[PDB]
Symmetry: D2
Subunit: 237 residues, 4 copies
């Protein structure tokens, strides 16, 4: 050797046994990316589906992933809790998911933005997070979907006031400050004749991914017991 | 909130202060990748330069990277020890580097393999490693370059016995087993008239990357004090 | 400051939320300790009760400890899973438990070994371990009690062959090698007229500690659902 | 097994190679302890020497400790950077030091407080901290000694105003608020005829411990190059 001792400094990063491991990817500086690639506000069917695409690439190229959830510039992958893939080394789980996803992005870019030219190669960030119980995991997801629902309902009526109402951003925010759920939902139905509840289920619920085999996308609620009692092969395994 | 508590389970991963942080990327299952994309043995000018390309993308899109080194299906990025980028969160450092690199790969694929068609989107793995001293860091690099030199000298004469000598792999390995440095180096000069020491400096030394501004590639030795006394802006900062 | 920056190098050690934290203490070089303080084989009522003593000291001086279990030169303390004591910093949990226990040992030494003189100050080691589920925690305990039962049944018949049978250690081990449960249990009943099942419940079951208030010691089985259905205030909290 | 799988949940805690490991002990609730055991303000020769005692116990019973430093209710042990004791497992280093120290405390209590009766068994806390360079380590110590010097100079004149000047605490603090170094140092020399610089070197410099063999206590400055150039066997090893 004479130099291989340096390998000793590599610290362990094993994830806690019998726990759900979760890798959450989120595009870097994507606010600036959507700009330069003219993304549709508040939702851009192309983007969401490209992301859902990459997501599947990942769910197929990697392993033990029993579910994924996407929304905005992000995706979460939930590996089977008894996974033994890579000895549960957190560093592996996050870097493979992250790299795979990022190379799949530029790859399938044309399939979704046939007209639009990818200006530069995009960045993504990762992280691993361990959830000890099905409840905590479930809660994690709900935290995400719910985050989605709170952002879409905000952006939908936020951009309708800028575009279809001709208001500068600084205004639309000043006008929506303090509004409740029914508050915004009304500003839509009555101020733009938009019935939120009719919006695409991929904008107000995000995207789910399950095996059916292959990773079939869905836009159903995952916060309610129903979805889970309907799909028990996912958690009790 | 009502669900945001789940965020609390995200464990710290801060890297030890005043230490060199190092991210080392290495292509996944690349043995099978080089196969399907017909890579040249023992070296493939295209591959090495694409890698060196991505590497620069990374050194520009990210920050505080004072040096990089590449070889085979890998690259190491050494961030400035007093870096404060991302509060030294190991998870960030590795996933950005990994994702960026992977998206840049498919992006600039044509520029290097204009003829060859990228068959699928490639995978990369990451990791962070902290080195407490300039000596240990330097040793790390030497470990890499030296690893490079030991593999190239082995593969060069390993493939010359299979290709230009018509030997099955199982043979060439049985014939090289136990050979010393001068042993292989001779099997070349006298059995194929190949003077190893004349081989491309990018095959037997790998690739280095420094600022000159922009990331200029080099193929000089980094194991010898010379290189460092010649470039002190890199370590003593 | 001018020197306080060094405080920054103190790494986080927070234990995973909603998880059972467990500190397990085990006397250092106690084999040599029991020797010099003439401990009774295979059990020494003094030792076990001193340990159970210290254990209570700990359960009172520290907090959120919902249960403890002792045996041989060790004790395990199980903190309430939603504990927030010390922000769940693993380093605190283990060092307080360890120090407290060690000072209580020398303190109450006379109360248990009134005749015997403590020769030197004894050492103890600690560690923290996180268990994600009640099942895993329960399993942990069973692992301990069961370890206890497997050692006591071995030592009881191991020392009866050395003392009451006049056999050198090397022999008694050669004679017990390969024996089953009923094998040793018989070597007792028929070779020394000792009915194992009649042995003190503190030798073959160890010691448990629960609040009743104060930490009341017990010597009942904790591997069987009974104990738990009998004491639900412990886990479901 | 059938239960031993639970052992798998024990996470690694290895300290970074080629780095100074440091265990810092600090008495728990000692403010209340000194009270009940009538400690002398601002310094109590008994306490400081008992602590320095325990400290030596530790430096002898454990290993690779190349130096220690004490002051107030605390002590720091600095293990030799290339130590391999316990595979550098942080959990071991801190719990042994902590337990050993705590049992030695109650043990040698009489030798220092022959008159005073130890009321209850005392608590201590631990932690491990890794320093990458001799400079950072040195700085750590200076941080401690300097902390000592800043507290002793504050307490000395803080208690002289309460005792020898008959002022309630709330006052003495209101009077010392905003004073500089020369400010307090003068309030002494001129208001109580006390020349600080003449105070015991164990009160304004703390305590150091080196091998000479055995752990010989000292009260010299360790912040100045002198001490180190005078003792090079400690760091360059
Ligand atoms: N117009 C448009 N922009 C979108 C859409 N989905 C995501 N984005 C963009 C704008 C959002 O600021 C961004 C996602 O939020 P982030 O918090 O990740 O912001 P950003 O990516 O700048 O931050 P980060 O990369 O995490 O540092 O992606 C979409 O459907 N349409
Ligand atoms: N023909 C050819 N293959 C190359 C060249 N550079 C790298 N490779 C391939 C073959 C090597 O097995 C591989 C790099 O070694 P690795 O140990 O990373 O193997 P592999 O990527 O299969 O493992 P891993 O992905 O780490 O699990 O990349 C090249 O210039 N020419
Ligand atoms: N005679 C006697 N010895 C006992 C009794 N309880 C414990 N011991 C002693 C002998 C055992 O070897 C030791 C506990 O087992 P350990 O595996 O902890 O051994 P030891 O303490 O030497 O190792 P360690 O300190 O963990 O490095 O304590 C007892 O009741 N009677
Ligand atoms: N009278 C007196 N008290 C002392 C002496 N040395 C230490 N102490 C006591 C009073 C100080 O508040 C205490 C050491 O400071 P700490 O910050 O450790 O306070 P305390 O032990 O309450 O906090 P902790 O246990 O860390 O939670 O020990 C001494 O020589 N004389
Ligand atoms: Mg983010
Ligand atoms: Mg983002
Ligand atoms: Mg986002
Ligand atoms: Mg590898
Ligand atoms: Mg590879
Ligand atoms: Mg490789
Ligand atoms: Mg042990
Ligand atoms: Mg032991
Ligand atoms: Mg034991
Ligand atoms: Mg403290
Ligand atoms: Mg204290
Ligand atoms: Mg203190």
């Amino acid at each position: 050797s004479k130099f291989e001792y340096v390998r000793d400094f590599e610290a362990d990063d094993t994830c806690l046994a019998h726990c759900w491991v979760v890798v959450r990817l989120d595009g870097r500086n994507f606010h600036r990316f959507a700009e330069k690639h003219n993304f549709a506000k508040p939702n851009d069917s192309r983007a969401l589906q490209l992301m859902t695409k990459c997501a599947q690439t990942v769910m197929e190229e990697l392993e033990d992933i029993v579910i994924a959830y996407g929304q905005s510039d992000e995706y979460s992958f939930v590996f089977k809790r008894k996974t033994n893939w890579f000895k549960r080394r957190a560093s592996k789980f996050m870097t493979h998911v992250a790299s795979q996803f990022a190379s799949s992005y530029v790859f399938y870019w044309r399939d979704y933005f046939e007209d639009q030219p990818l200006l530069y190669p995009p960045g993504f960030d990762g992280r691993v997070v361990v959830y000890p119980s099905n409840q905590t995991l479930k809660d994690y997801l709900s935290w995400r979907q719910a985050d989605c629902h709170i952002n879409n309902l905000y952006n939908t009526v936020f951009w309708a006031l800028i575009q279809q109402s001709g208001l500068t951003p600084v205004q639309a925010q000043g006008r929506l400050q303090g509004t409740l759920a029914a508050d915004k939902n009304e500003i839509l139905f009555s101020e733009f004749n938009i019935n939120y509840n009719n919006e695409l289920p991929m904008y107000r619920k995000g995207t789910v991914l399950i095996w059916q085999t292959k990773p079939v996308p869905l836009h159903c609620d995952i916060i309610g017991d129903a979805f889970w009692k309907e799909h028990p092969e996912i958690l009790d395994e």
